[PDB]
Amino acid sequence: YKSHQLIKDHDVKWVDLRFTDTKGKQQHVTMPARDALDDEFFEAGKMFDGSSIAGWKGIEASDMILMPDDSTAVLDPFTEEPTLILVCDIIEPSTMQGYERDPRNIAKRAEEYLKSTGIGDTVFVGPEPEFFIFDEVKFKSDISGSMFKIFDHEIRTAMCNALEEMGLVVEVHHHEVATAGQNEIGVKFNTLVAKADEVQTLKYCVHNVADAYGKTVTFMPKPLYGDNGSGMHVHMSISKDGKNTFAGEGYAGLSETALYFIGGIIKHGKALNGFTNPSTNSYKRLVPGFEAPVMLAYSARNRSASIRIPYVSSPKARRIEARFPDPAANPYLAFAALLMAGLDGIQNKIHPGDAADKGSLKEALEELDKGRAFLTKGGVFTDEFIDAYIELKSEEEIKVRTFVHPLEYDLYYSV
Amino acid sequence: YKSHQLIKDHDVKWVDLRFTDTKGKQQHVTMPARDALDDEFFEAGKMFDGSSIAGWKGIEASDMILMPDDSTAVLDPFTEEPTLILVCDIIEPSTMQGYERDPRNIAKRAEEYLKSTGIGDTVFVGPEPEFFIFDEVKFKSDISGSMFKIFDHEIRTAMCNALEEMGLVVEVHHHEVATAGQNEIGVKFNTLVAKADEVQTLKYCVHNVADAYGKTVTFMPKPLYGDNGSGMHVHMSISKDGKNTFAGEGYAGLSETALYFIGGIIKHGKALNGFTNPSTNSYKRLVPGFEAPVMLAYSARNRSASIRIPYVSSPKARRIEARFPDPAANPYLAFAALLMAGLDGIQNKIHPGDAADKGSLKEALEELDKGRAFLTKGGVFTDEFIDAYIELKSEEEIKVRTFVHPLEYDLYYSV
Amino acid sequence: SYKSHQLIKDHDVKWVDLRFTDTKGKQQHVTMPARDALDDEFFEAGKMFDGSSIAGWKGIEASDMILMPDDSTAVLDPFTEEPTLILVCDIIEPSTMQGYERDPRNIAKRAEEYLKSTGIGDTVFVGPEPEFFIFDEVKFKSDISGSMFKIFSDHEIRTAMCNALEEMGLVVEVHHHEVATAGQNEIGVKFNTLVAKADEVQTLKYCVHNVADAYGKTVTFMPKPLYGDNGSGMHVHMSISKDGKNTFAGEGYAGLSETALYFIGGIIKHGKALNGFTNPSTNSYKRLVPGFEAPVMLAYSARNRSASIRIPYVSSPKARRIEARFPDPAANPYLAFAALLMAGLDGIQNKIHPGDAAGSLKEALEELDKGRAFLTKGGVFTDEFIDAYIELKSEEEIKVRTFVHPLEYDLYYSV
Amino acid sequence: YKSHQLIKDHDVKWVDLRFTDTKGKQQHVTMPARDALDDEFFEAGKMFDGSSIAGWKGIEASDMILMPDDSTAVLDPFTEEPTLILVCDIIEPSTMQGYERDPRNIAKRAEEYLKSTGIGDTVFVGPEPEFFIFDEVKFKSDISGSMFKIFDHEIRTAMCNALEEMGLVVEVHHHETAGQNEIGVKFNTLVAKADEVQTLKYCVHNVADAYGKTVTFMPKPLYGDNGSGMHVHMSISKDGKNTFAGEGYAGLSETALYFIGGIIKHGKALNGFTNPSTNSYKRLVPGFEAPVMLAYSARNRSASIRIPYVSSPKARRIEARFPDPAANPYLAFAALLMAGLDGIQNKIHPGDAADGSLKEALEELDKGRAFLTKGGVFTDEFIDAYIELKSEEEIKVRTFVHPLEYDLYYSV
């Protein structure tokens, strides 16, 4: 176990276990390093009580065990004392299986289902998140009124260095390509679960580094009204014994398997928004007059299409690019939903039609409720989890819809 | 490759790839030094998306590749960490040729056309840009009103030192020769593309040094109403197997080839203003009662002519000096347009006439739209690029023409 | 998923060092630059190697062999000036990608696999106790003119040795000092499995030699360096475990089970042949003489000191084991342990009853030659290797037997 | 140019031009850095007089120009002051052509001839030269008598570090018997590999001298121990395809078989260039690793040509065992390549896989010079000069009086 060598080498004091909740926040706990020296630590885990977390309120969450994943052990750069960072999963003590409401468990089950189906062996995915940097931000809401107000190589190199030390392979750093204050950091693709963990670590590192310089950084889909929005493209492909199953001959060198994948994604697009755009702010984006994709179609050149086929000289690098997702989406759930939607299309050989050439959160939730059929396919998802998620998001939707806004005062106060 | 040697020597951390857009501004991206070691970098390039840039709104622009030019690799003096600067071109991955709307590609095509025509083997060009230095400057525009307001060996030595480290060859450094706050720095002439790149680097270095010393510097053609303007004289000549093809006998020892060159430039002068004077501010300079030229004529003594023949010790150094251009002009496009006009003059053997002895942006664009014929010879320019440029420059003219001005309030508010 | 990757990354190791043991029992080593080890294919393909010059491997095969590193053994060298990574290696025939016919480590691994297949048990636990001598200086010489050997004869050095072993990664338990005679020493180390313990013995020898040389003294492991003093030995404690249960533990003489009794009976029956592997030196039989601590009679006892097999008293059944007394440090660890294990397994399988509780190298080799039957059983040993080994030892046997010794000058010079 | 950049960065003071003579020793000349900055330097070279060198004793050698090769510029680690090192070719002022007696020119012409022939596109060569390390050595010879007498990780790491600073890609360091060492270096093309061999020898000598020991590459320094050879792995590539790879004995193609057959047929003559020393024939005797039989096999040790096992078809190569470290690298590699090409062109069948003296070698080379002059890379003038040069050493060794004869015949 890599943790033993790391601890022995760098006399670590504290161990930081981390796990993501339903909403997509990394909860963490800390322990002294003494316990980790026992293999029984990795064979049994540690008692935990997650009943207080938003998505897990219930009888089951009152008793759970955390199982560390030694594959992810690293050292923390920021702490003033040697600290060992680990990711963990949640296991039910009664049955020793992964908890039903764990996004990481859901993603692993999705990978297992893909492996069992025999369509392919592995899946490679690369996201392209994006964020904004500001000097200061203020906001407030109260019965009496509301406010929100907003107010180079140094920090860019600092972020790149921090990511490198944390163990990610940077590739490019786009700066203010579209509008002021917008940045993007590319990272090499990887497998599903590993890539999700990498996204979590990237967000954490960016937040800390930006804070250290007195700035602020945000991943909101659209923080400014009359400016460009922030998206997260997703490049994806499937591999079978070293063969790019998507690579082939046809439109843009795609195979019928890839075409069926696209057709399935197109068919289930409406349901996917419940996971790839789980925010009211998200739908401020996806509006005509900006870079956002407005038309649900696939094309190789048209910019308005929601699915694109980037040019790759080598057939080994054929991939599908989905444009609609947003940073607010939970990585595990979004990737699993996309994979399931594609596999559904493949299983029925749904022809996607001609390549294109020349909404709201409430509606998305309603669509998902009816379209839940394919997600439960193979037992990866469960209706219990789906219902809990739907209720959890509906609460926020209602909260937003029932409030009053200063624009209303401007428009109607005098009348 | 020189880049490999430099990286190995100085353990460079970051690579800065730079290019220019249609407006003449330098955009750049950064990468970790790792990926540049393998020759595959120089054999394939890196993916890029230029759709956001002003003049590259075409759909095909969504997926461009950047091809570095190893001949220009240098080390950055300013950056704290070792950084390797390179210039790049834009290639279309579908075809594997330079993108149509790339000014550097246009300049290279112009050089190739000259070589193929065989009138000469190479062309040497030297520009003479000026600039102004101020302590502070403020400006603002809004529906409620508009505003603009203005407010030594050390800095000159610093600028010269920075240029030398960056790799240029300074020759002379003037200082307040005609008006307060004006300066110019001579630099050794060179070939077309190399000289354009040198001009870009010169602008960058001057800006950085002036900022570092707490001043401000501007290349605006005429920032002050009552004072002189900033011109950019251009000296040029053509060489064929070591022979100064312009060197000859007759008026000022000039050959008939050079005389036809002058005649062609005179004939197409009105069209060239669309490139040599691409800003409305440019035509504030071109007015009587000042250093600026007035008449479209050539003379070795008359300082009011727009073309001149400097005295030279030997025929080897015979060259033609054009006065009307301004610093705002894009180097690549201006040089290419001048070269093509001269070549057309030579081809048609247009007699320039007698040596002289004793407008507006809208008009220039209109004239260019009809005079486009010669620019398209040999496929150096394309009508789509010309039309896009014309529209892009026309938008600014419309914006400036429609807006109100404080002088109007001064003149007419009481009437 | 490799210790070596992390070690190299975290300690900027410059050099890698591959080690392997030959037939005689001496560790050969070869060095590499570190950069090559970072590729995963390194552990998949090994490195080409030519061992045809080694003593026991003289043959046609030995010209094309690959060293296959074992990542489990990676460590850092304490003694070297520059950071160096030590690895152990197996030998593979490129023809079949299988273990080499004559590799002691391969033989040991095959013996473990055969035990596992037999179904008698699951793992073997082995603990050796090699003694050794420390001296101030030693000289020796032999030539046609005569022969000579001469011997010239503390917390600090013992502490240094223990520290070095701890750094190299062993688990020390006790340090006996001059219990029986002046100059003799012993370091106890925790038991382990067969192959790992065999590797640990080699590391112990290396560390002891290096520390003794560093402090300016000399050290030896030979069975009997002095005529009047005691010899040195390797008591071997052995046990077999199945599903976490000590199979030897039971009700019987000294709390032994029928399995243990059959094991002992087999060892008793085959003891004559085992001497070929456990006592491979002529000097070994100088130790095995009456009147000292060495065993004489081939029997098993719980109290008698003359028996060659003992049943030490232990606190719990978990620790029940068998102690064999005759082996000596000159033996090759892999071959010795494998031979003992196979003899015991033959005893168990044939249900040989040991009875009731209480030579020369030439004869031992003859006995092994005629009794090889029980070693080839299961394919762990092969007649080709056995013949090669016998031929290798017979040369030394003859060379010692046919020489002229100084004592003969005392006895017969004047006769 | 690489040299301009290097000088500008490291404010170099001195340039050092190096070349090799017929016997293989490397001559050098120093120069102030001022003149290297001019571009006319690399276009005109420097005037030189080589008439005093062993193999070039002719009227022609009065006026020669050294043409530096920019591709080889490096920095010296051993010098106190920053020094640049460049390799040079020799050009006749009369015709601006390479000098006939320049081994580097011969090697380059051999490469060009291969390219013209159309059989392939490039050659890959890897040598494996061994050497010996000793503590002290003495030797003397005069009318009154003759005599000679002979008397770790740190040093090996030092040599590897020095080679890395030079820019060689080290791969492995074999150690042992009783003082024998080998350092593996990644293969390369012909001329570059020859230059790398020269630099390896130079660095090893300097590093050993620094620690105070001594190092020798002579093929057999001791009577009772092993010798030192230079196994040579060779391959030919065409359009990125290993032409040797194919179906057949040990996975060899007909081209490889013809190559082997040609080498076998012309092996007797090759000894002139591959073993150009009397001492080198003390090694070629039965009872040691040295091969005696002139045949090819994949298993037998005594065969002179071997087909090593390899993982992929790309790495298929031919190994020649007989060559010797005393050989001049350029001449040796060129001779091997020409023998192989003659074999391929004439389609000589090697046969079936198995399962002298310098005087004789020189006579055989003189007799069979034909295959070397084909294509015009070697010239009868150079071959005659080389034979003439080696015959003096042969005679001088043959006609001397040796101490062993005193033991055998003094009392007879």
Annotated catalytic residue D182: yes
List all residues 6 or more positions away from D209 whose beta carbon is below 8 Å from its beta carbon.
Answer: none
Best A156, A164, A171, A302 residue to mutate vs chain B (most B CBs within 10 Å) = A171
Contact A274, A166 (CB under 8 A): no
CA distance A127 to A201: 13
Whole-number Cα distances in Å, B61 to A127, B24, C164: 21, 18, 65
Closest-CA distance, C32 to chain D, in angstroms, reads 5
Say whether D172 and C47 touch across the interface (CB within 8 A).
Answer: yes
Amino acid identity at B287: V
Residue ranges of E strands in A195-319: 216-218, 233-240, 243-244, 295-299, 305-308
Neighbours of chain D (3+ CB pairs under 8 A): B, C
Which residues of B fall within a CB distance of 8 Å from A310? 47, 63
Say whether D6 and B2 touch across the interface (CB within 8 A).
Answer: no
> Would strands C84-93 and C15-21 be described as parallel, antiparallel, or unpaired?
parallel
Do D and A touch, 3+ Cβ pairs within 8 Å? The answer is no
SS3 label, residue A179: coil
3-class secondary structure for A351-369?
CCCCCCCCCCHHHHHHHHH
DSSP string, D59-91: SGGGSEEEEEEEEEEEE-SSSSS-EEEEEEEEE
How many residues does this entry show for chain C?
Answer: 415
List all residues 6 or more positions away from B112 whose beta carbon is below 8 Å from its beta carbon.
Answer: none
CA distance C185 to C167: 20
Helix axes D358-367, D267-274, angle to 10 degrees: 120
Say whether D6 and B5 touch across the interface (CB within 8 A).
Answer: yes
SS3 label, residue C134: strand
CA distance C360 to A263: 84
Contact D357, D276 (CB under 8 A): no
Contact A86, A3 (CB under 8 A): yes
Q: Which is nearest to A271 in space by CA: A392, A391, A372, A396?
A: A372
Say whether D171 and C60 touch across the interface (CB within 8 A).
Answer: no
Closest-CA distance, D309 to chain C, in angstroms, reads 7
Contact A107, A192 (CB under 8 A): yes
SS3 label, residue C77: coil
Contact C307, C326 (CB under 8 A): no
The helix or strand, by DSSP H or E, that contains position D24, with its residue range, turns out to be none
Measure CB to CB from residue D153 to each of C33, C80, C94 and give the nearest one.
C80
Contact D264, D258 (CB under 8 A): no
Contact C303, C350 (CB under 8 A): no
C3 close to A (CB below 8 A): yes
Whole-number Cα distances in Å, C106 to C47, C56, C101, C127: 18, 15, 8, 20
Which residues of D fall within a CB distance of 8 Å from C36? 171
Instruction: Give the other-Cβ count within 10 Å of C405's Cβ.
Output: 10
Out of C103, C112, C131, C328, the active site residue is C131
DSSP string, B331-366: HHHHHHHHHHHHHHHHHHT----SPP----HHHHHH
3-state helix, strand and coil shares in percent for chain D, rounded to the nearest 5: 40, 25, 35
CA atoms within 13 A on the CB side of A330: 23
C47 close to D (CB below 8 A): yes
Helix axes B331-348, B192-212, angle to 10 degrees: 150
Phi, psi of C362 (to 5 degrees): -55, -55
Neighbours of chain A (3+ CB pairs under 8 A): B, C
CA distance D107 to D151: 39
CA distance C260 to C121: 12
Contact D20, D26 (CB under 8 A): yes
Which two tokens mark B68? 């570095």
Say whether C64 and D308 touch across the interface (CB within 8 A).
Answer: yes
Place of tokens 């494998």: C338
CA distance B203 to B192: 17
Place of tokens 């002992």: C264
Phi, psi of B149 (to 5 degrees): -150, 150
Q: Which is nearest to B335 in space by CA: B229, B189, B180, B161?
A: B189
Contact D257, D244 (CB under 8 A): no
Out of D49, D112, D135, D388, the active site residue is D49
Say whether B63 and A310 touch across the interface (CB within 8 A).
Answer: yes
CA distance A264 to A280: 25
CA distance B39 to A317: 19
A5 close to C (CB below 8 A): yes
Q: Which is nearest to D22 in space by CA: D104, D91, D95, D128?
A: D104
Closest-CA distance, B29 to chain A, in angstroms, reads 6
Which residues of B fall within a CB distance of 8 Å from D5? 2, 5-6
- Alpha-carbon C72 to chain mean position: 20
D389 close to B (CB below 8 A): no
Annotated catalytic residue D363: no
SS3 label, residue A15: strand
Which residues share a beta bridge with A147?
A140
Best C10, C12, C168 residue to mutate vs chain A (most A CBs within 10 Å) = C10
Contact D372, D364 (CB under 8 A): no
